[PDB]
Structure formats: structure tokens, C-alpha cells
């Protein structure tokens, strides 16, 4: 359409057309908006587009057009400024300056085009970064002078100074070289005396204007870096803490300044300064109390009403109070005349802590943690805060979030259901709350018990009964486990359990019973110490959990299983010994009834149960008794297994049955579960099934392949084939789980490994890509990790079977076969670590693929792959270095040294692998240092490419200068030479080396970078 006209620069720019396109973009919709957007981006991106900026700024009636004009200028100034002829630089400065002067002098424009003015200011600041002070020394004096001539200009100057301070001190680290950042910071520092004088004057001669707010906003920025004397040796604290707190327009910004003041670096041995620090706080709290709200005010209600800027004000008050007090509350704790200030400040925080807003609560909870941690250690302090801490106990107890363990929740219909998913974002919160409450319990264990026990009584009587109340209380009670004496715990837990049992009887119906069930389970699981001392009650608890495993409420059932294993993890010794007055260790009783106990559970719940039994069985250290227990535990699955193995072996037909495939999968999963908790002790059970299991692995593998043959790749999606592959995966998982914990590695090598490799390697190698299980690679990693050193031919066999075929799956893009990709590089890593010889035996073609594979890895953005990619490369270089002066080492360097240098530089400089900067730098440093230390014996150059006897240092620099020259043709030769000189010198100091690399990354983004920047020290 017509809109594309602006893209023809052979003609003159039709400004009317430009404004129509911009307006179509900002105010339009649909296809028209989209077309307009593409046009504007192409316009913006035209490298002569800047030449139209003045024309646009002059003629346009659309402020967005002018904004876009300024974006075009910014891009030019930030990237190509020093390319420009000098007169174009003067011209650009002049019309940016003129436009700002112009817009500030027209009151209407100043009032209503603030976006455009702000943008113009930033653009100016970009010019200052380039030109100031060296080629603009009069900028600050003249800004200061102009400020007196006009209120609007003075105000806008404050915006400019704010932006300059941000760009120089807050955002310079990633955007400028170290030298340039130092230059500009020093320049700002040198002229700040006068900047501050203006700031202070403005603040004295005004009340709550926009000029005042602008000035204070700039002050917030200055406070990040200015010396403390500007704050403590002028009257400015009094102004901030009194005058500017009174008007709401200035209050928001002032409070943020005062928070930053509270972070200033300040002498610690000076009583005057201390008094000043006390006074501004006193003033500030006084203004809040008399101009905003008193200490008794309901801040929970105020925040909830959400009027005007109240939420942000309350947030900022929380930030101010917590920042100041964490730093300075000791200033207030010894002088009696300051006690009321200390406590009122804390009472405000107590009120702030009642607000319903999670993120704000976290901010306040962080402070409370800081406080109670100090009161726990520091002599003679806790009595000061006894009343505050007492209110804090109530707040925490009443705002306890649901622990991970509690799996029931209330739905929108008021029904208590099992949770759909984990509440992952409240895990940290629960921990934080618990930490504070534990400290608070230690600080006054009598107060805590009293509060909990009477809150509990008001649940039983009915007065305060609700799901929310019984819950938070129950969670709070569980969370303080460990803080009381055994004796007090005993009486406490006894009272709590009685009361919760009473509630269970009294509160009828499915929802009530679920709630109370969940609560008692949580509590009892939290107090193993009590359980250990009270066998009869432990026994009763476990038996009740077994009853709950038959519950139709699925939340309760699931939690019964988690609670069983949680208790068992802590109390297992009491299950393995024979208790007084019992005829058998309780583990025997559990195993005998396992079929009945677990009959209504889902499979994964059964596996959890079996895992728990394994925990107990592994407490038995007499091997005969342990193996016997293991044997008894595995009786059901072993009988199921035996019958299945007899069928299977007679004819591979029956295994097609999906009911049989599920049965098999659950047998192996049960074995995995028990192996997980028994580890090394699981071996006899593994031995009972091992040979038949690997035969099954083969039979199922044949079926999978047959099905893919008869049905196509789509077969891999079917329930049957997924079921068959689940068997393979669980088998692999079982062997991995066992080998990862094995203590007899001789048996692993002699009994387990050869049949494993025989069953899995060729099957992997000879299936089509979509039928290969990444879990094979995962199993092999653990095999190599644990016994690789004992099986060098085995490791060779692993590489042969998986290396090339897996590489060919993952080397066409970065996304297909994501699991294979991740497990592939983990395997190569451990092989490179533990069995480097395996790579030495590779044929040269295959070793070349290995090097390619590693470089491919570090071009991933996927962190799993990239990180291993970089580690492998590092480890490989070390492995080669370790061989010393031998033909393989020399050929490695001749073939691959520069490939590693160039590939590492590539990911360092492309902007798409910033996550790996640290490890890229480490590898590069290693590589450069190899030459710098003459650790490469042969010349890296060939024949008469360069004079005979030329050192590898000289050739390396030559190579790099040439590489960088061609790759970054906008750099000067001097920038390149200076960069490499610096980098090569610094190849033994990683921090400095990395700074030089970062400086280089800044300079490649622009033209004209100063080569002396690389001298920074």
C-alpha cells in the first residue's frame, strides 16, 4: 500500500505520510497496524534514517513520530557516533539541545509532551556519555546557570542529571568499558559539589512542587554513590525527615531517599553522626504518626481498600522501617528516652505484618528473622522486645501457609479435595515462617505454649472453630518441633493429640474428617522424638495410617502413605527391633499383612510403601536376618515375577497382553523402590531376578521393533509400545539405581556389566532413532562413573554402540531428541573424566566427530548441554596436556588447538551464549596459557607459512589478530592489537582476563573504541 513510501529515500520524506503510518501503528488495529509496524521498523533501521531526524522533529504533528526520530538518533549516537564527520556531531548536539530548550520554554508543550521531553533528555545524556566532559567542559556550569532563569528548565535539568547519574553509576557495568566508566564516574564526582549546591537550594526554596519532586528523584539516584558528608554535614536530613514528609506529593520519594540514606557508608565511632541518624528517624516516625496514621491504625484494612497510592506507600514504609532498624536499632536500645521510638517503629511493623500481601509479608518476615536471630544471641536484648515478640507469635501462627506435606485443600465449592498440583511457590515461605517461629519459641517457650494451647481450646469449645483456624494452628504446632524440652513436649503433644482426636469425633462429615485427618497426620509426623519414646502410641499411629490407606478420600490416603514413610525415615530402628511386650519386630507384622494393607492403594502408593519397608530392613545389620526380611518383603512381586517368567519363556505371545505389561512394569517399579532405600543391601534380590530380567529386556525389545516394523514410527505413540518401553526404562532404572549405590564393585564388573552391555548396547545401536531410549545413555553414565576404570574394553564398547548414532540424532538442530542430547553429553563427560583411553583408541575420523560434538555442545543455549560442553572441552585439554610431549598430544594441538580457540571466541562474542561467559573465559584462558607457558611442543603453524623457529606466541597473536580483523572489520588494527596484548598478559588472572573480555564485548558493539581502555588496572 501507500504507507511504504517513507521507505524510499530517493524521494524526500513525506512527514504527513510518516505521521499516518505511526498513527496507524499506535492507534490502529489488525492487518493495518501490523503492516504499519513492519514499515516503521524498516524505516528506523535504515542507516541514513537519522539524517531525517531534524526534518521530523521540525515538521511532524505527531509526538510518537518525534519519539521514533529520537530512537533513530540514539542508535546512531550509541553505536556509530565516532564514525560521523565532526560537523554532523556538532549539528546533532545543537538540535537536541535546541529542541529541549524549545520544549521547556513553551508551557503547554512542557505540560503535555512529557514522554517526548524525557526521551530527548535521555538522548542528550547519550551524547554526554560520548562527549562530556572532555569535549564539553562547560555543560554542568551552564546547566546550573540556566536553572535559575526558568522553573521548567530547572525541573528538566533535574531529570537530565537523574538520567546521567543512572547511566554513569547504576547501569554502566554492562554498557561501557571499565576505563570509560571510571572516566565518567570521576567526572561526575569532580563536579558534584556544584550539582549538590543547586539541589539543596531548590529544596530549601519550595514545598511540594513538581520541581521539588524532580529534584528529590535525582537525589534518590545520587544517594547510590555520593559521599556521606553531603547528607550529614548539610541540613538536608531535617528537610527530608520533616518538611518533605508532610506533603503526599513529596512523601513517596522522600521516604525512598531516607531508606537509601539509611544505607550510606557512615563512620561508626562518631557520636554526632549517631545522633543525626537517630534524629531523622525520630522526625520521620513523628510525621507518619501525626500526618499519615497513628500506630494503632488498621493497616491491613487500609492496604485492602487500595486507595490512591496507599499500597505502594505502605510497601515503602515497610522497606524504610526494616532497612533502618536492621542497620540501626542498636542506636535506640540503651537510651531510655529512645525506647518509645524503638517500640513504635516496631509496632508499625507489627501492623504492616498483618497486611494480606504475600510479597510484602516476605519483606517483613525477613526483618523479623533478622531481629529474632539477634535476640537469640545478643546479651540483654530480648527483654526490650518481649511485647513485640508476643504479638509476632500471634501474627505468624495465624498466617502459617500450608506445608508441603498437607495434600488436602478447599475448592471453590467448599469441598475438601486432594490438591491437583504442588503449591511450589509457598515452599520457601513455609521454611521462612518456621525459622522465625522456632526462634520465637526459644525466646519464650511459656508464651508460645500458652498461645497455642488456648487457641486450641477455642477450637474444641467451638468459639473460633474453622478450617482455616484449625489448620494454621496445626501447622504452627508441627512447625515448632524441636524447640521444647522432652518433658514439656510430652505434655504438649499429648494435649494437642487429645484435642485433635476430640475434634475428629465431634466434627462429622467427609470434609471435616479430611481436614482434621490431614492436621493430625502433619502433627504426629513432625514429632518423631515423641514417637520414639512412646512405642504403644507409635504402633497405634502406624496402624491408623494403615486404616487410612483404605480411605476413599484420596487426599487422606495419599497423605497416609507419605506420613508413613516420613515417620519410618526417623523412627525405623523401632520397627526393626523386638519391642518389650511384642512377640516379633514390627517389620515382620507389616510384611505379613502387606497384601491387605496396600490392597486399595494405587501402584505408586504401593511402591512408596515397599520403599518404606526397605528403609527399615536396612537397619538390620545381621546379613542373614536382613536377606531373610528382604526375601519376605519381595514375596508377592517375586511370585508374580516367577509366574510371568514361565509364561514368557514358553512363548512371546502372552507379553503382547497389556494387562501383563502393566503387571511386569509394577514388579520392576517395586524392585526399584526397594532398591532406592536399600542400596547396596538390595543385591540378593537383584540376583534373584537379574538374568531373567535381561532376557525379558530382550524379548520386549524384539516386540517393540516388530511393532514399529508392522505399524510404522506411529507405533511408538501407542499404549502397547509405551508400555513395553516402560518395562525397558524401569529395568535400566533398577540397574542404574543399584550400581549407583553398590559397595561391591567387583561383583558389579564380574556379574552385572557384561550381560547388561550385551542386552542393551546393540539393541540401542540397531533401533531406529525414535525407538532408542535415552535412559540407556543414563544407565551407562552411572556404569562408567562407578566402574569405568575397571572396564576399559567395556567403555570402548559403549562408545562404539552409542556415540556416532546418537550424535547423528542431535546434530541437525538444537531441539530434536532433547533427553538424548542431555544424556549424551553427560556420558561423554564421565568417559572423558574416568576413561580417557577410550577416546585415544578411537579412529581419527571418530575422534574428529568427538571434537565436533563438543563444539556443537557449547553452541547450545540449553544450559544442561552448554555447561557439559564447556567442561568436556576443558577436561579434554587437561587430558591432552597430561600426556606431555607425545605424538597424540602434538597431533591434537596441530589439528584442534585453533578450532577450540576460534569456537570459544565465537560463542563469547555472538551475544547468544551469555549464560556461559564464565566457563568460556576459563577455557579461553586455559588455551592461551598453554602457548604462553610453552606447553605446546610442536609449532602450531605449518611449513613456510611463517619463518622457521617463529615462536607459538607470535603465531598465536598473528592468528588472533587476523581472525578478529576479519570477524570484526569495524575495529581498528590498534584496538585489536591492544586487546590481544592485554588478554595474553592477563592469562594467569581470571578476574582481570574476564574484565578485558567484557571490555572487548562493549567495544565490538560500537565504532571508535579507545584502544588504551585495555590498559585499565
Amino acid at each position: 500500500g501507500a504507507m511504504e513510501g517513507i521507505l524510499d529515500f530517493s524521494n524526500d520524506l513525506d512527514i504527513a505520510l510518516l505521521d499516518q503510518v505511526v498513527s496507524t501503528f499506535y492507534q490502529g488495529s489488525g492487518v493495518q497496524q501490523k503492516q504499519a509496524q513492519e514499515i516503521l521498523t524498516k524505516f528506523q533501521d535504515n542507516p541514513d534514517a537519522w539524517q531525517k531526524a531534524d526534518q521530523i522533529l521540525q515538521f511532524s504533528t505527531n509526538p510518537q513520530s518525534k519519539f521514533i526520530a529520537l530512537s533513530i538518533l540514539d542508535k546512531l549516537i550509541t553505536r556509530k557516533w565516532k564514525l560521523l564527520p565532526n560537523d554532523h556531531r556538532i549539528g546533532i548536539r545543537n538540535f537536541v539541545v535546541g529542541m529541549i530548550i524549545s520544549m521547556c520554554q513553551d508551557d503547554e508543550v512542557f505540560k503535555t509532551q512529557k514522554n517526548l521531553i524525557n526521551k530527548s533528555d535521555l538522548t542528550l545524556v547519550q551524547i554526554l556519555k560520548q562527549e562530556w566532559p572532555q569535549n564539553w567542559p562547560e555543560f554542568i556550569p551552564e546547566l546550573i546557570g540556566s536553572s535559575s532563569s526558568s522553573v521548567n528548565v530547572c525541573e528538566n535539568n533535574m531529570i537530565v542529571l537523574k538520567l546521567l547519574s543512572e547511566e554513569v553509576f547504576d547501569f554502566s557495568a554492562e554498557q561501557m568499558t571499565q576505563a570509560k566508566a571510571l572516566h565518567l564516574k570521576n567526572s561526575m564526582s569532580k563536579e558534584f559539589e556544584q550539582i549538590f549546591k543547586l539541589c539543596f537550594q531548590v529544596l530549601e526554596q519550595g514545598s511540594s512542587s513538581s520541581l521539588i519532586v524532580a529534584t528529590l528523584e535525582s537525589l534518590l539516584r545520587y544517594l547510590h554513590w555520593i559521599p556521606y558528608r553531603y547528607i550529614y554535614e548539610t541540613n538536608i536530613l531535617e528537610l527530608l525527615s520533616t518538611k518533605f514528609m508532610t506533603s503526599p506529593d513529596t512523601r513517596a520519594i522522600t521516604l525512598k531517599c531516607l531508606t537509601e540514606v539509611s544505607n550510606l557508608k557512615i563512620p561508626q565511632d562518631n557520636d554526632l553522626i549517631k545522633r543525626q541518624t537517630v534524629l531523622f528517624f525520630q522526625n520521620t516516625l513523628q510525621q507518619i504518626a501525626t500526618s499519615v496514621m497513628p500506630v494503632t491504625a488498621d493497616l491491613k484494612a487500609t492496604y485492602a481498600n487500595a486507595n490512591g497510592n496507599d499500597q505502594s506507600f505502605l510497601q515503602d514504609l515497610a522497606m524504610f522501617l526494616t532497612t533502618y532498624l536492621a542497620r540501626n536499632r542498636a542506636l535506640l536500645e540503651s537510651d531510655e528516652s529512645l525506647r518509645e521510638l524503638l517500640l513504635n517503629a516496631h509496632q508499625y511493623l507489627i501492623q504492616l505484618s498483618k497486611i494480606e500481601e504475600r510479597e510484602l509479608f516476605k519483606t517483613t518476615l525477613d526483618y523479623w528473622h533478622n531481629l529474632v536471630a539477634d535476640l537469640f544471641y545478643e546479651p540483654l536484648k530480648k527483654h526490650i522486645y518481649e511485647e513485640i515478640c508476643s504479638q509476632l507469635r500471634l501474627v505468624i501462627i495465624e498466617n502459617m501457609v500450608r506445608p508441603e506435606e498437607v495434600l488436602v485443600v478447599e475448592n471453590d465449592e467448599g469441598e475438601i479435595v486432594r490438591e491437583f498440583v504442588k503449591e511450589s511457590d509457598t515452599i520457601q515461605l513455609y521454611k521462612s515462617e518456621r525459622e522465625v517461629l522456632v526462634y520465637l519459641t526459644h525466646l519464650n517457650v511459656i508464651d508460645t505454649e500458652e498461645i497455642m494451647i488456648s487457641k486450641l481450646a477455642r477450637q474444641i469449645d467451638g468459639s473460633e472453630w474453622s478450617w482455616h483456624n484449625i489448620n494454621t494452628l496445626s501447622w504452627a504446632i508441627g512447625s515448632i518441633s524441636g524447640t521444647m524440652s522432652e518433658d514439656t513436649e510430652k505434655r504438649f503433644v499429648v494435649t494437642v493429640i487429645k484435642d485433635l482426636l476430640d475434634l475428629c469425633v465431634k466434627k462429622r462429615g467427609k470434609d471435616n474428617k479430611a481436614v482434621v485427618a490431614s492436621d493430625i497426620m502433619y502433627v504426629v509426623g513432625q514429632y518423631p522424638r515423641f514417637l520414639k519414646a512412646h512405642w504403644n502410641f507409635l504402633r497405634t499411629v502406624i496402624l491408623k495410617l494403615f486404616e487410612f490407606m483404605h480411605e476413599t478420600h484420596e487426599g487422606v490416603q495419599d497423605m497416609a502413605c507419605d506420613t508413613f514413610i516420613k515417620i519410618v525415615q526417623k523412627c525405623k530402628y523401632h520397627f526393626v527391633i523386638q519391642q518389650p511386650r511384642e512377640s516379633e519386630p514390627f517389620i515382620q507384622t507389616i510384611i505379613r499383612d502387606i497384601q491387605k494393607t496396600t490392597a486399595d492403594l494405587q501402584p505408586q502408593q504401593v511402591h512408596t510403601f515397599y520403599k518404606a519397608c526397605g528403609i527399615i530392613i536396612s537397619e538390620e545389620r545381621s546379613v542373614a536376618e536382613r536377606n531373610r526380611l528382604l526375601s519376605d518383603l519381595m514375596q508377592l512381586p517375586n511370585m508374580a515375577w516367577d509366574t510371568i517368567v514361565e509364561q514368557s519363556t514358553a512363548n512371546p505371545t502372552l507379553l503382547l497382553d497389556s494387562e501383563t505389561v502393566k503387571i511386569i512394569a509394577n514388579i520392576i517399579k517395586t524392585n526399584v523402590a526397594v532398591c532406592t532405600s536399600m542400596g547396596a543391601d538390595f543385591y540378593p534380590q537383584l540376583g534373584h531376578i537379574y538374568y531373567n530380567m535381561l532376557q525379558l529386556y530382550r524379548a520386549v525389545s524384539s516386540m517393540i521393533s516388530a511393532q514399529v516394523a508392522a505399524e510404522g514410527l506411529i507405533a511408538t505413540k501407542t499404549p502397547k509400545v509405551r508400555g513395553l518401553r516402560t518395562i525397558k526404562k524401569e529395568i535400566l532404572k533398577l540397574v542404574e539405581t543399584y550400581i549407583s549405590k553398590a559397595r561391591n564393585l567387583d561383583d558389579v564388573v564380574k556379574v552385572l556389566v557384561e550381560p547388561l552391555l550385551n542386552a542393551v548396547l546393540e539393541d540401542y545401536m540397531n533401533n531406529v532413532p525414535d525407538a532408542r531410549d535415552a535412559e540407556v545413555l543414563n544407565c551407562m553414565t552411572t556404569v562408567v562413573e562407578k566402574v569405568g576404570h575397571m572396564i576399559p574394553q567395556g567403555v570402548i564398547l559403549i562408545l562404539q554402540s552409542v556415540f556416532e548414532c546418537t550424535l547423528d540424532m542431535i546434530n541437525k538442530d538444537f531441539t530434536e531428541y532433547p533427553e538424548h542430547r542431555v544424556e549424551f553429553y553427560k556420558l561423554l563427560k564421565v568417559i572423558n573424566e574416568k576413561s580417557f583411553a577410550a577416546f585415544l583408541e578411537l579412529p581419527p575420523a571418530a575422534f574428529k566427530l568427538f571434537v565436533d560434538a563438543i563444539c556443537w555442545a557449547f553452541k547450545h543455549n540449553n544450559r544442561d548441554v552448554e555447561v557439559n560442553g564447556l567442561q568436556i572441552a576443558l577436561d579434554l585439554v587437561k587430558n591432552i596436556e597430561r600426556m606431555g610431549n607425545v605424538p597424540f598430544a602434538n597431533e591434537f594441538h596441530k589439528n584442534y588447538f585453533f578450532i577450540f580457540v576460534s569456537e570459544t571466541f565465537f560463542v563469547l562474542t555472538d551475544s547468544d551464549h551469555k549464560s556461559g561467559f564464565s566457563k568460556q573465559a576459563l577455557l579461553l584462558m586455559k588455551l592461551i596459557s598453554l602457548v604462553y607457558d610453552n606447553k605446546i611442543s610442536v609449532p602450531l603453524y605449518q611449513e613456510a607459512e611463517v619463518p622457521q623457529g617463529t615462536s607459538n606466541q607470535v603465531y598465536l597473536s598473528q592468528y588472533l589478530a587476523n581472525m578478529l580483523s576479519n570477524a570484526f572489520p569495524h575495529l581498528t588494527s590498534e584496538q585489536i592489537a591492544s586487546f590481544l596484548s592485554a588478554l595474553t598478559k592477563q592469562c594467569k588472572d581470571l578476574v582481570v582476563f574476564k574484565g578485558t573480555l567484557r571490555d572487548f564485548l562493549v567495544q565490538i558493539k560500537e565504532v571508535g573504541g579507545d584502544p588504551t581502555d585495555y590498559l585499565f588496572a
Partner: protein
């Protein structure tokens, strides 16, 4: 809201997909409660399904007598079928739907209820 005049014959949690024939892929359309609603005035039974949290309608169509539930090759807990007139997004529109459930039992119960609803609508 427009559901007070209806009886809930069946409710189950489900994930609804729609087939993009161009991309040749299934695309999720919503997860939540799929309900079979019978209008008390017309006795006509519809499927109405809404997304969790946003409560937006991801299915709204009569359970036509002519529809047939078909298995998907990938799943033993889903049904696929062709719908000629769904108004979840407003204007009546044809779709091939797949609906998946938490279990095979659930999928089988759905089919049974779906076919019952079809006979009600036939009346």
C-alpha cells in the same frame, strides 16, 4: 451466566484438544470440568466445558445423535470426534475435537454417558 435452566447429567475433569489440520497437530483448547447439561425446557443435552481459573468456555455444543466417539492412536483414555457447530468462541464453527481424561475408567464412563445423552437428544 446462562446455566440455571439446566440439569447437570454428568461432570468430569478433562483436557480438550482441537485439531489444526494445517499444522497437522493437536492443540489444547482447555482443561477443566466438562459438563453434560440438559435444558429443562427443550430437554436437549449439551456439552459445556470451562477453563480452570479463567472460567472461559472451551466447549459449547449439542451432543448430536450423529456424532461418534473414536479412539486416538496415542491413547487409551481419550475420544476423538467431529463437531459441526461449537460456539465457545462465539460464531458457530466446525471442529475435530479430542478429549482426554485422567483414567481409562473415566474415558469409558464419558462414552457411556455421551451415548445416553445422544438418545435423550434423539427424542
Amino acid at each position: 451466566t446462562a446455566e440455571e435452566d439446566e440439569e447437570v447429567l454428568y461432570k468430569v475433569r478433562a483436557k480438550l484438544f482441537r485439531f489444526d489440520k494445517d499444522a497437522k497437530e493437536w492443540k489444547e483448547r482447555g482443561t477443566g470440568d466438562c459438563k453434560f447439561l440438559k435444558n429443562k425446557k427443550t430437554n436437549k443435552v449439551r456439552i459445556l466445558m470451562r477453563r480452570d481459573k479463567t472460567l472461559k468456555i472451551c466447549a459449547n455444543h449439542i451432543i448430536a445423535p450423529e456424532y461418534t466417539l473414536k479412539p486416538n492412536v496415542g491413547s487409551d483414555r481419550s475420544w476423538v470426534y467431529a463437531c459441526t457447530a461449537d460456539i465457545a468462541e462465539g460464531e458457530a464453527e466446525a471442529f475435530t475435537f479430542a478429549i482426554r481424561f485422567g483414567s481409562k475408567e473415566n474415558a469409558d464412563k464419558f462414552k457411556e454417558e455421551f451415548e445416553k445423552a445422544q438418545e435423550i437428544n434423539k427424542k
